[PDB]
From TrEMBL:
Protein name: Levansucrase
Keyword annotations from UniProtKB, A to Z: Glycosyltransferase, Transferase
Species lineage: Bacteria, Pseudomonadati, Pseudomonadota, Gammaproteobacteria, Enterobacterales
Listed EC numbers: 2.4.1.10
Domain of life: Bacteria
Length: 417
């Protein structure tokens, strides 16, 4: 017997979070310009999911780059959105996007200047009217895709739907996305359920093939199981806080975690829930859109979090947080000491969200709210400038800003059927 250290959740502690520096130029997103272009006058987009293979390679098909987006109609003539003076209030329309979210696709031979493709699934295919985020996985040279996504209301279920991409020299179509399959939902012993917490998270599936074992796993956002308000911020959740920083307040209401599941097969059909990789009890309620970069034989685990969902007595920016391990199952340590990788600038704290770090170091995000004066601001619902980061040991560094929605491919796949 070679005894191995047992698998245990890595704790993101309050002491770790106290290191978060909102004013670090190496971990701040470049300022978004108030004059940003808008992709569509018909729909809002936000969460953006590039087509990729199971190993994480961003993929074009016959030279066409493809992205999937969470999408919502713009409703400029809706009476509900007319203000006191009978003028359209975009903020109300934008805030209602989540309740009417649908999966669209877009394509481009340049990895930018996206051409809208429309709905992935015909209306009525999804068992829930709300389609929330996940991952489009290109399977083979027949152009078959497994779209892993979150079916929301009733409940929140990780699901997948098989279809295929068809290309011509004029553009791209998504066909045959007809049969949504239930994979798993929160169990209540490892991941918190709606019964335990009306505000529970269970979403953002990120399937991947482990580069070391070759087994299929899948990350998702969850909360630590237990009735809302029952969790305890104990010595491990507090961590090594300095004198005067012992008070956890009511931070036991913040219970975010990064979950992982394992597949019994190579087709991603039958999944088993595992205990979480990372827990943030007392630190942050929302460890969103968990995803990996594999580099230098290490596991870089990224998650998107918000200022608003920090534990009592803690703060930090909206943006990218992350951890690094030698091993898939840890132990993980916080990148840059605190976990902060790419924070919004405090002068434009809501400029972007739902970032995605790709294996080439390029980080895509969508524009939310950009200030244009003392009280005035613009709504995006469009792609932000891509920004290159470098991963180096347990450090990250912002390097270079690229064009709006620049998502170049890492591989091209030759498709016919």
């Amino acid at each position: 017997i070679q005894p191995y250290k047992p698998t245990k959740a890595t704790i993101w502690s309050r002491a770790d979070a106290l290191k978060v520096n909102e004013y670090d130029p190496t971990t701040t997103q470049p300022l978004v310009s108030g004059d940003f272009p808008v992709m569509s006058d018909e729909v809002f987009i936000w969460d953006t999911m590039p087509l990729r293979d199971i190993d994480g390679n961003i993929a074009s098909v016959n030279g066409w780059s493809v992205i999937f987006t969470l999408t919502a109609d713009r409703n400029p003539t809706a009476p509900e959105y007319q203000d006191e003076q009978g003028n359209y209030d975009i903020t109300l329309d934008w805030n209602d996007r989540h309740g009417r979210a649908k999966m669209y696709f877009w394509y481009s031979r340049t990895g930018k200047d996206w051409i809208i493709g429309g709905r992935v699934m015909a209306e009525g295919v999804s068992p829930t009217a709300r389609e929330w985020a996940g991952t489009p996985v290109l399977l083979n040279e027949r152009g078959e895709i497994d779209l892993y996504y979150t079916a929301v209301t009733p409940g929140a279920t990780v699901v997948k739907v098989r279809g295929r991409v068809v290309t011509t020299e004029n553009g791209v179509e998504m066909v045959g996305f007809k049969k949504v399959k239930s994979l798993f939902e929160a169990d209540g012993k490892m991941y918190q359920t709606e019964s335990q917490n009306p505000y529970w998270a269970f979403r953002d599936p990120c399937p991947f093939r482990d580069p070391k074992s070759g087994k299929l796993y899948m990350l998702f956002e969850g909360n630590v199981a237990g009735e809302r308000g029952s969790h305890v911020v104990g010595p491990d959740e507090l961590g090594d806080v300095p004198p005067g920083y012992e008070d956890a307040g009511n931070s036991h209401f913040q219970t975010g975690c990064i979950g992982i599941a394992v597949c019994r097969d190579e087709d991603g059909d039958d999944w088993e829930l595992l205990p979480p990789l990372i827990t943030a009890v007392g630190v942050n309620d929302q460890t969103e859109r968990p995803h990996f970069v594999f580099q230098d034989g290490k596991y870089y685990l990224f998650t998107i979090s918000a200022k608003f969902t920090y534990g009592d007595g803690l703060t930090g920016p909206d943006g990218v947080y992350g951890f690094v391990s030698e091993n898939l199952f840890g132990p993980y340590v916080p990148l840059n000491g605190s976990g902060l990788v790419l924070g919004n600038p405090p002068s434009q704290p809501y400029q972007t969200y739902s970032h995605y770090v790709m294996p080439n170091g390029l980080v895509t995000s969508f524009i939310d709210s950009v200030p244009t004066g003392e009280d005035s601001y613009r709504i995006g619902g469009t792609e932000a400038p891509t920004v290159l980061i470098k991963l180096k040991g347990a450090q990250t560094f912002v390097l270079e800003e690229f064009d709006y929605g620049y998502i170049p491919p890492m591989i091209d796949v030759k498709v016919e059927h």
